Design a protein around this ligand. Structure first.
Ligand SMILES: [Zn+2]
Lengths: 158, 173
């Protein structure tokens, strides 16, 4: 019944960060809105440095994004599983518990940037039961983004 | 030392569009930001970007303001994420070169390792080819003196493997 909608730039940034961080698990924060009881809207993400979340970095990035028109709240976090699929480890569950204490609706997204190159994006979204369950993911694309991406694909591969 | 062509990741174009839309830019206004990547070879690779706070006066093209501190503070956060993606120039939403662009470009010369790239991204693209025009500043030679001007460089799209699948995944819904 609940859906996590992921924006175009959110998906590409998570894949990009995950690919650049291979073979490490990299993580970042997801920005957006809990628009109603059934919808999480992930409009953007940002990477966190490799390292225990650096609160100084997070606060600074949030301050600067607000200055350029991105004032959305943290709705969860993402991290990469380079080559071994989407799921939550024990450490991941502990990290997600910390996020859920801050906002009960927080979502944990996991992306596999290695398996994704086989042709289909490998990604999932989780929340804890009180061990965990998968949320449906869908993608939000504006008419302008669709037209841009369609034209880029046609130009590149004709 | 001579740049001859530019490649651009789809993410950069989508980021410029998201910047334009989230700041409610309309009419003759433009948004402005930084591009990152690698410009140490004849092909400039543009692989990331971020938005800048930017104001300019409606009529007087000589009145404009760009936050130096924002450039530096954000670039340092980008450095902590991926040190290989250097500050290589700037972008704006155009759709065409503006009278202040050579002077703005001089500001970015202080931040780039090489001659800065300006990327104009037409976020109001109707259908005719890539929505981009890429420029570097040069001296142009009457053959008695020279003047600074912009030189258009050809662009193509180049996607990293996973990002290309990301694009196809978005297109397939
Ligand atoms: Zn994990």
């Amino acid at each position: 019944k609940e859906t996590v909608y992921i924006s175009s730039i959110a998906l590409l940034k998570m894949l990009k960060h995950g690919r650049a961080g291979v073979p490490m698990e990299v993580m970042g924060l997801m920005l957006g809105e809990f628009v109603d009881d059934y919808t999480v809207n992930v409009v953007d993400v940002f990477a966190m440095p490799q390292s225990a979340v650096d609160d100084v970095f997070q606060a600074k990035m949030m301050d600067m994004l607000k200055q350029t028109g991105r004032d959305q709240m943290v709705v969860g976090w993402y991290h990469s599983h380079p080559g071994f699929g989407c799921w939550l480890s024990s450490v991941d569950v502990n990290t997600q518990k910390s996020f859920e204490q801050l906002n009960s609706r927080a979502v944990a997204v996991v992306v596999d940037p290695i398996q994704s190159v086989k042709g289909k994006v490998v990604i999932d979204a989780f929340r804890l039961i009180d061990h965990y369950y998968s949320l449906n993911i869908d993608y939000h694309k504006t008419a302008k983004e669709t037209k841009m991406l369609m034209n880029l694909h046609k130009e590149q591969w004709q | 030392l001579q740049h001859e062509k530019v490649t651009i990741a789809p993410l950069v174009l989508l980021s410029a569009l998201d910047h334009y839309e989230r700041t409610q830019t309309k009419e003759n206004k433009r948004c402005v930001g930084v591009i990152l990547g690698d410009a140490n070879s004849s092909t400039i690779r543009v692989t990331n970007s971020f938005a800048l706070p930017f104001e300019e006066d409606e009529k007087n093209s000589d009145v404009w303001f760009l936050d130096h501190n924002y450039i530096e503070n954000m670039n340092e956060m980008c450095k902590k994420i991926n040190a290989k993606e250097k500050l290589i120039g700037w972008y704006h939403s155009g759709p065409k070169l503006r009278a202040s662009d050579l002077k703005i470009n001089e500001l970015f010369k202080k931040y780039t390792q090489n001659n800065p790239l300006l990327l104009i991204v037409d976020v109001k693209q109707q259908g005719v080819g890539l929505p981009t025009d890429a420029y570097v500043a040069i001296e142009q030679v009457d053959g008695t003196s020279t003047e600074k001007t912009f030189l258009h460089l050809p662009c193509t799209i180049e996607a990293e493997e996973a990002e290309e699948i990301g694009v196809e995944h978005l297109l397939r819904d």
